[PDB]
Design a binder for these strands. Structure first.
Ligand SMILES: [Mg+2]
Ligand SMILES: [Mg+2]
Ligand SMILES: [Mg+2]
Ligand SMILES: [Mg+2]
Ligand SMILES: [Mg+2]
Lengths: 192, 396, 166, 55, 188, 273, 56
RNA sequence: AAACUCCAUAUAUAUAAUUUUAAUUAUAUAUAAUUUUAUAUUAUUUAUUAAUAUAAAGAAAGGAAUUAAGACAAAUCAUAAU
């Protein structure tokens, strides 16, 4: 057929040469092959099927339908870790996304500073180190609508650097006082 | 038979072209300077027709080609294993037997063994360590020779990552369970199930690290292990974590790049086939393709160029990111007011915009669940009554 | 990303135990008879074998009443024999019913028995007709040899109907 | 049916005995190179000094 | 240019190959049923691919009509009868006809496809046997002797490094090739 | 080889990764009657440098278990990692289902590439039974991996003209077969499912065939020449299948209007090759 | 099966009046022929299955 | 909400050695439409505009699944669970 003993041993393991030989001597040359359009059987990519690829072929020694090991041949005995992790880089981050980190989670002033730098170019270092935060009023505000009483969280906050700069901001949220004061702090920093 | 005389016939036709009784027509080189070129023109037009037949009747590509594209070929296929969930996965029990009574028997057995598997997960260590191993539903696979029970499990708390390798010298309360499932020689649960199914049985505990990668595990965990955080009211910290489990992904951009990648895949396969259609075929003379029924271009390595297992498989897979989730707590989760309460936490989106701009078409599981949605309800009992945790997740 | 692929050709021995249960071949009948004998004798087919490694937990569920309500009890766990020393039962009736294909056919009853029972002639003729009808109508029912024999006798009129365990 | 038979029944006459090997080999090479090896689409994948060139 | 890809691996990427019928007799008829045409057709393609290598002329996956069970049930646990909901179940049927093949080759085909049957599919096999009008059915000694000889020559072994074996098959041959089985015929 | 894990004595000189995966094997197997073994303990202490754990810790972990781990550390698990923000290091369950579909595809494709070729060793030349000498056809049914009762049914079909009967016995045979013979096709068909296994059903059909043939050949007492053949069952069958026997009238055919083949010299000048 | 000729029609191997007792059905069969005024220029051999008279 | 989807529509392609014939068929895949233009007339955010007129080209015209939030302390503790 295409290649008989053409260095085929160097490219395929000896265990398969018998199968290739049998195929050469059973499928005739000039066979009028035709691609199938009703059903799909081969992968969209091209593979010689001579190596068991992790995460794309069943892990040996682990139970799975279409397995050929007996109940006394399984070689998996630990289940505290994810069998068959992801290939390549081992991660599936979309384009333009970052792994979550601390990100100043310990202080929402860091988030406020980053947002205000993004929006208007003020100094995150200054906002995070030289500004003092102080709520003044934190109360529940209600609206009566068709469905019923919709309660809202209202906060007002003063932010000041103790050296002349001062501002106040009001923030209204629907879910939590924390988001209310976050919005208020944002507005105050804007309105210094 | 042979053109040696058809040439003379056509020369006579040229004479007629000038006049039916004239010697010859206007001849720059005795009708050879451009008549031969026109003959070659018609021959190459015949080649064009045969060639586009050649390419068309040998086309097979994954679906996802944006119609706006120009180089996209006429062929398309959505049934690629990586781009749609096989409908056999819709049903928890995957069987067909010509004996309907046996079929009913087997579905009964599947349900009962599933409930047993649920009951067999909880564990004790020292009377103040209660470990619950949340497990999804069981996927029963009934081949003609062997039965397989496959499920996804999430341990309540894996051993601390900061902890040293000390885990290598003892087997956890969960490792013991998973080992007695199918590793013990004459004692494994598969041996017992073989009596009920008169078949060879297998079990697969696929591990999951996060609870929100599956709708069953997520709802089960909320309804069984997080009661104290919402019994008298949903804790704000719990709500914050539950709402920020996943970042705000740009579904539009994700879908657009997926479609563009499929476009590139198809176009580069098309280019491979075209270069085999033109650059090759030199030594091998024409008419050996026998385009009537044979369509073999050449070496499969050349038809599939720069398409290995390292780049193609992963970028075409679907249902990969969680871009939306909704949680509903309903029932008497409040000592005060003694009434029903519903709390809904909705984040993200619930539409796959991949199907909106490409040729890939959605398929409804059980004819009512969109392919991209996975949802589950779990009911439990507290001192006030029954309450339900309903979770819906959208994967893009 | 590389792992060796080990090969083992699919020899007929490997493909055995999965030949059609009903095939047109005396060889197939012999093979299927042996497999059915193993299944009835509780060979470790469809499950892992019992080797003498586990001493306390070596149990099986293939009790005579498995799957049957009538006796009445909980799931009985019976200690299972080791792979060796396992007695295999071969029923000659099972052989002549799966391999060769012999059938009993309910050997008829003739006028002498009914004449002995009753002196009248019309009764004898009617009883013979009854026995013929029962003989040609009771074969299609899937039943055991002894029980079918008893039913045939009772409905013919030989044994009293008390033999049926009223 | 009304043309091809007449043209094909003249090859027996036109064969004659003149040497043709070289000429027919050259003609066959010409057909292979031009008709059968023409590239319909090529490849893997100045100063406009004169105005009104199309003119 | 690159590493060679032989015909065996190049065949996976094209439609399965068939062997022409040279006489025309139908030896077997395999009907595949499932609720999932995807697995149904994938497995049918696998069958048609193994038949070629094993030398069995197979016709191909003839699609027989699909059967639609229908039910209608009310949507409410209690009285709401004006609203009802319909449920359906489709059974998909494919047919593969095997012509001009020896019974043992056909046996081994069925055995291999059972070995590697998918999930959610079912096989019904109709086997046809040509026979003479009158059959000699009293042959016991020479009969079983020749039958066991055929068993031995079929399920033989010549390679001990490669290949796989079944304990059940080993025991089956062990008990078949035994003097107690020889006398089990007519020990009466 | 395989039984190495059952012999903790020969766990000497093995690499730590092999002493492990054998200790784990002994713990997985022997799950309920595992007993501590000094040989296992000694072979395990050699892996202290492998796993960077103290030997004094290995001993007490071996002799206590999970209680030993909670002794090594302080309070039990307290931090709730259930809602830990996603790291994009793992794939959802539905994605894993799709990946499993692809894994199955690759399994079957490797089979078709390398294992199916190896069963061409068993190709055999087809010995066709002589159709003259094998007129009867026995049909068997099998339901793989099931217990369908119909698996016991066997059918027998022959053609009457191929029985080897002279006209009189053939007529008698048809008459005695009654509804099991359709003259329009000349096929005698009869099936049996009244015995549990096919072996019997086939023998029973063969016996009825022999009995019918014997009676047909016996024309000394009665030959049933006066009785014509009954076809009413065949008529009933025919009424239940729509028939399409009409054929296109032959005089309406007009070949003189069929499409002719146009002459083009491209094929005549390119077919020489 | 339509082949040029006279105005002959055979429906399911039967005459038009035999198969179609309704006049409107015969007129409907004709209609193409009369819009192209070739009623007497083609022979029709029609074989139908399913539905009723009007459908066929 | 629309689309995506299922039953239907047309075309192709693939299977059936047309004696499971219904090839006038079966069901796998793909294409097509939530139709295009051309001049007419009223008009009018001016042409980039609709409503019609209907030369033309098209096989192309339906059906059902899906019924949000809030409510009526609507029905359901007799489907089961509480
Ligand atoms: Mg019928
Ligand atoms: Mg809608
Ligand atoms: Mg509503
Ligand atoms: Mg009431
Ligand atoms: Mg109740």
């Amino acid at each position: 057929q295409h290649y008989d003993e053409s260095l085929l041993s160097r490219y395929y393991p000896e265990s398969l040469l018998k199968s290739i030989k049998l195929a050469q001597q059973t499928i005739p040359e000039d066979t009028k092959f035709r691609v199938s359009r009703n059903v799909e059987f081969a992968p969209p990519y091209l593979d010689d099927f001579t190596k068991i690829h992790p995460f794309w072929d069943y892990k040996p020694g682990m139970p799975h339908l279409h397995a050929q090991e007996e109940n006394n041949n399984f070689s998996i005995f630990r289940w505290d870790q994810v069998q068959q992790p992801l290939p390549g880089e081992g991660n599936i981050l979309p384009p333009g996304v970052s792994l979550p980190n601390d990100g100043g989670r310990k202080s929402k002033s860091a988030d406020v500073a980053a947002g205000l730098h993004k929006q208007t170019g003020v100094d995150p270092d200054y906002i995070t180190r030289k500004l003092t935060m102080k709520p003044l009023v934190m109360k529940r505000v209600s609206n009566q609508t068709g469905k019923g009483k919709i309660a809202s969280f209202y906060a007002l906050v003063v932010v000041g650097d103790k050296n002349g700069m001062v501002g106040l901001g009001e923030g209204k949220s629907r879910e939590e006082m924390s988001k209310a004061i976050f919005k208020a702090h944002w507005d105050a920093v804007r309105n210094l | 038979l042979k053109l040696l005389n058809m040439i003379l016939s056509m020369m006579n036709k040229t004479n007629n072209n000038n006049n039916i009784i004239i010697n010859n027509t206007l001849d720059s080189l005795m009708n050879k300077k451009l008549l031969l070129k026109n003959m070659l023109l018609d021959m190459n037009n015949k080649k064009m027709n045969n060639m586009k037949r050649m390419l068309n009747n040998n086309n097979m590509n994954p679906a996802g080609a944006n119609p706006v594209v120009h180089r996209i070929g006429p062929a398309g296929n959505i049934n690629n294993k990586l781009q749609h969930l096989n409908n056999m996965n819709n049903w928890n029990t995957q069987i067909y037997n010509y004996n309907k009574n046996m079929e009913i028997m087997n579905t009964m057995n599947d349900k009962l063994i599933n409930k047993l598997l649920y009951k067999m997960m909880t564990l004790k260590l020292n009377n103040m360590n209660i470990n619950k191993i949340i497990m999804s539903k069981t996927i029963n696979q009934h081949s003609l020779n062997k039965l397989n029970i496959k499920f996804y499990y999430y341990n309540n708390d894996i051993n601390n990552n900061n902890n040293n390798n000390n885990n290598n010298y003892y087997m956890n309360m969960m490792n013991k369970l998973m080992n007695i499932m199918n590793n013990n020689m004459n004692n494994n649960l598969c041996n017992i199930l073989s009596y009920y199914y008169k078949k060879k049985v297998t079990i697969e505990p696929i591990k999951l690290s996060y609870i929100y990668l599956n709708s069953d595990i997520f709802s089960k965990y909320i309804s069984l292990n997080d009661m104290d955080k919402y019994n008298n009211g949903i804790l704000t910290n719990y709500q914050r974590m539950l709402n920020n489990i996943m970042p705000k992904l740009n579904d539009h951009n994700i879908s657009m790049n997926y479609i563009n990648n499929i476009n590139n895949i198809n176009n580069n396969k098309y280019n491979n086939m075209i270069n085999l259609l033109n650059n090759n075929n030199n030594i091998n003379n024409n008419n050996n393709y026998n385009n009537n029924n044979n369509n073999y271009i050449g070496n499969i390595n050349n038809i599939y160029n720069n398409m290995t297992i390292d780049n193609i498989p992963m970028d075409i897979l679907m249902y990969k990111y969680l871009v939306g989730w909704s949680i509903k707590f309903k029932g008497r989760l409040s000592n005060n007011n003694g009434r029903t309460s519903t709390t809904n936490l909705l984040n993200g989106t619930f539409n796959n915009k991949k199907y909106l701009w490409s040729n890939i078409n959605n398929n409804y599981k059980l004819n009512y669940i969109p392919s991209n949605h996975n949802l589950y309800n779990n009911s439990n009992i507290n001192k006030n009554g029954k309450y339900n945790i309903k979770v819906k997740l959208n994967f893009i | 990303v590389s792992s060796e692929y080990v090969l083992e050709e699919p020899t007929p021995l490997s493909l055995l135990e999965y030949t059609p249960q009903v095939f047109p071949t005396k060889e197939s009948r012999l093979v299927n008879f042996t497999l059915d004998s193993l299944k009835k004798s509780n060979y470790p087919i469809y499950r892992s074998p019992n080797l003498g490694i586990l001493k306390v937990h070596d149990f099986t569920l293939n009790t005579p009443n498995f799957g049957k309500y009538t006796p009445g009890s909980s799931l009985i766990f019976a200690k299972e024999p080791q792979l060796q020393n396992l007695l295999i039962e071969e029923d000659p009736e099972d052989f002549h019913r799966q391999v060769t294909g012999e059938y009993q056919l309910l050997k008829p009853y003739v006028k002498k028995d009914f004449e002995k029972l009753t002196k009248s002639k019309d009764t004898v003729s009617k009883l013979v007709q009854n026995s013929q009808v029962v003989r040609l109508s009771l074969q299609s029912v899937v039943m055991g040899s002894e029980e079918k024999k008893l039913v045939y006798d009772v409905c013919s009129g030989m044994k009293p109907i008390s033999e049926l365990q009223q | 049916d009304e043309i091809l038979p007449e043209l094909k029944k003249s090859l027996e006459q036109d064969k004659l005995s003149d040497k043709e090997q070289q000429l027919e080999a050259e003609l066959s090479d010409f057909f292979r190179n031009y008709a059968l090896l023409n590239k319909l689409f090529d490849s893997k994948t100045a100063t406009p000094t004169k105005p009104y060139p199309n003119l | 240019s690159t590493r060679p890809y032989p015909v065996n691996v190049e065949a996976v990427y094209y439609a399965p190959l068939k062997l022409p019928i040279k006489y025309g007799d139908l030896v077997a008829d395999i009907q595949l049923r499932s609720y999932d045409n995807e697995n149904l057709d994938f497995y049918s393609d696998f069958i048609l691919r193994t038949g070629y290598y094993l030398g069995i002329p197979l016709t191909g996956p003839k699609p027989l009509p699909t059967r639609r069970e229908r039910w209608t049930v009310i949507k409410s646990p209690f009285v709401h009868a004006k609203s009802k909901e319909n449920f359906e179940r489709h059974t998909h049927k494919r047919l593969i006809r095997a012509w001009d093949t020896n019974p043992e080759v056909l046996q081994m085909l069925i055995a291999y496809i059972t070995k590697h049957s998918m999930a959610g599919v079912g096989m019904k096999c109709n086997f046809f046997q040509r026979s003479e009008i009158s059959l000699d059915l009293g042959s016991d000694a020479n009969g079983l002797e020749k039958s066991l000889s055929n068993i031995d020559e079929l399920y033989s072994l010549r390679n001990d490094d490669k290949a796989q074996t079944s304990a059940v098959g080993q025991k089956v041959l062990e008990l078949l090739d035994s003097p107690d089985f020889k006398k089990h015929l007519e020990k009466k | 080889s395989a039984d190495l894990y059952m012999h903790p004595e020969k766990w000497k000189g093995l690499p730590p990764q092999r002493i492990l995966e054998l200790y784990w094997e002994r713990m997985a197997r022997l799950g309920s009657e595992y007993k501590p073994n000094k040989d296992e303990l000694n072979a395990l202490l050699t892996t202290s440098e492998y796993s960077n754990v103290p030997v004094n810790d290995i001993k007490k972990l071996y002799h206590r278990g999970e209680q030993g781990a909670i002794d090594i550390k302080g309070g039990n698990v307290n931090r709730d990692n259930s809602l830990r923000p996603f790291m994009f290091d793992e794939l959802p369950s539905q994605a894993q289902e799709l990946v499993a579909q692809h894994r199955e595809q690759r399994f079957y494709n490797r089979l078709a590439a390398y294992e199916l070729p190896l069963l061409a060793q068993y190709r055999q030349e087809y010995k066709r039974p002589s159709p003259e000498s094998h007129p009867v056809t026995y049909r068997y049914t099998s339901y793989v991996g099931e217990e369908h009762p119909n698996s016991r049914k066997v059918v027998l079909s022959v053609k009457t003209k191929e029985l080897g009967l002279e006209e009189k016995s053939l007529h008698k045979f048809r008459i005695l077969a009654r509804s099991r013979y359709d003259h329009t096709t000349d096929i005698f068909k009869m099936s049996s499912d009244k015995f549990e296994h096919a072996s019997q059903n086939a023998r029973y059909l063969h016996d009825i065939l022999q009995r019918l043939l014997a009676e047909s050949k016996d024309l000394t007492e009665d030959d049933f020449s006066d009785v014509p053949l009954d076809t009413r069952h065949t008529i009933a069958k025919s009424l239940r299948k729509k028939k399409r026997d009409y054929e296109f009238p032959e005089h309406w055919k007009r070949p003189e209007d069929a499409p002719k083949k146009k002459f083009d010299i491209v094929d005549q000048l390119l077919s020489t090759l | 099966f339509v082949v040029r000729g006279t105005g002959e029609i055979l429906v399911n191997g039967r005459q038009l009046n035999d198969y179609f007792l309704k006049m409107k059905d015969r007129e409907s069969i004709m209609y193409p022929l009369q819009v192209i005024e070739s009623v007497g220029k083609y022979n029709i051999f029609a074989t139908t299955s399913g539905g009723g008279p009007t459908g066929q």
